[PDB]
């Protein structure tokens, strides 16, 4: 009854969760022209400013992912922002979807660190200026954290959009309860919901930039 | 252990003297300087400079600009572009010119020629607090 906005949506027995995951790309029109409209002029600028941010820090092999790590910050920042609409089912609150964006991009990042350049990837586990006599303890950290980075991504994003929606939905129910009670209090609980919606707008973008930065930093440490 | 050197462009107050502490008004905030202080180098802002002789007796000059440079061998070289002892400044013109400076800012809106007013304001604001 409380987690209702996270159950897979179905209308007329049809799994409507597919027309919701495939919609974000519909808000990004493209054109071959040279001078287009305001939408594609602002979007092609954001993609320019974004790609120059995540990708500048990479070498030539890391920059071959400049289509992936840009088409990923565009898909997470548009799925989150389409979740703040009323009653909307944002599929980034799903541990299934988030585990499907996290494991491949991570596994495909350490594999290229183990299928090639492996002898160099063996040197990140042991920092440069490290004395020896307590190495058999540090080996646990750099591996067990590596083995849990793919689950850090998918849960840092799941637990931040879920908890952001749960809070806005509870504080919302508060204003509904104090509506039939002292009303000058309703307006102070509501203005908390407004400052909270401006926060959930920012955390809708920040959680997209951090997800695609930590996938970038994993890549930078394997190319 | 300390080798002070306090000198105006036309006057020398200390030279190689052995004082124990100086209190200078650096741009990054004032700090006191005893022997073996960490090597630094700064640039002053309008404010007092208290010099503690070995006898514990002070001496208070009002520098206006310059550059103190504590060195690795505990030598100090404080050079003030205009360092007048407090017995030469007056309180009336400081408070008055500060008002002539403050009142002239609001009538100004250009970023450059207003920046020169705030520097004159703080130079006079640091004056009233030094005298009394």
């Amino acid at each position: 009854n409380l987690f209702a906005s996270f159950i897979a949506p179905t209308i007329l027995g049809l799994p409507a969760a597919v027309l919701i995951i495939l919609f974000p790309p519909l808000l990004i029109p493209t054109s071959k022209y040279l001078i287009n409209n305001r939408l594609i002029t602002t979007q092609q600028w954001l993609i320019k400013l974004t790609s120059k941010q995540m990708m500048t820090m990479h070498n030539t092999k890391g920059r071959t992912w400049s289509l992936m790590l840009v088409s990923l910050i565009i898909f997470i920042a548009t799925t989150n922002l389409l979740g703040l609409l009323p009653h909307s089912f944002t599929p980034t609150t799903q541990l299934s979807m988030n585990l499907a964006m996290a494991i491949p991009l991570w596994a495909g990042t350490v594999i290229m660190g183990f299928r090639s350049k492996i002898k160099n990837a063996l040197a990140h586990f042991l920092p440069q200026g490290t004395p020896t006599p307590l190495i058999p303890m540090l080996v646990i950290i750099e591996t067990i954290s590596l083995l849990i980075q793919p689950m850090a991504l998918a849960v840092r994003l799941t637990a931040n959009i879920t908890a952001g929606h749960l809070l806005m939905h509870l504080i919302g129910s508060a204003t509904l309860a104090m509506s039939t009670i002292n009303l000058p209090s309703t307006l102070i609980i509501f203005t908390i919901l407004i400052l909270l919606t401006i926060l959930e707008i920012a955390v809708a973008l920040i959680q997209a930039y951090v997800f695609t930065l930590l996938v970038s930093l994993y890549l930078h440490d394997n190319t | 252990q300390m080798s002070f050197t306090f000198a105006s462009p036309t006057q020398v107050f200390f030279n190689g003297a052995n004082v124990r502490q100086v209190d200078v008004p650096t741009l990054t905030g004032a700090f006191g300087i005893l022997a073996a202080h960490v090597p630094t180098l700064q640039v002053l802002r309008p404010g007092l400079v208290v010099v503690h002789a070995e006898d514990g007796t002070t001496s208070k000059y009002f520098v206006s600009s310059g550059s103190i440079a504590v060195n690795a061998d505990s030598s100090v070289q404080l050079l003030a572009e205009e360092a007048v002892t407090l017995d030469m400044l007056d309180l009336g013109a400081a408070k008055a010119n500060l008002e002539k400076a403050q009142a002239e800012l609001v009538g100004t809106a250009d970023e450059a020629t207003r920046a020169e007013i705030q520097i004159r304001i703080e130079a006079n604001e640091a004056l009233v607090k030094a005298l009394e």
Binding site: - | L34, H37, V38
Partner: protein, 75 residues
């Protein structure tokens, strides 16, 4: 006997306030290093502040161990 067994919890949980002092003594003796690496000719007076701070925080770390010994034995 649920009370005598409860004393082992109230006395084992009161003694975690000591983890406050132990963190306010590393701040004091970590500020004595930052304040002595700047003006080392004050080593005398700084150390007489890193003792007034050490003996005022570690007093709060003893008020906890005072109640830990007030529940465990004085009751």
């Amino acid at each position: 006997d649920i009370d005598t067994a409860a004393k082992f919890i109230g006395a084992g949980a009161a003694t975690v306030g000591v983890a406050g002092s132990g963190a306010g003594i590393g701040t004091v003796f970590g500020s004595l290093i930052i304040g002595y690496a700047r003006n080392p000719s004050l080593k005398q007076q700084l150390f007489s502040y890193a003792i007034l701070g050490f003996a005022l925080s570690e007093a709060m770390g003893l008020f906890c161990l005072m109640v830990a010994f007030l529940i465990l034995f004085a009751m």
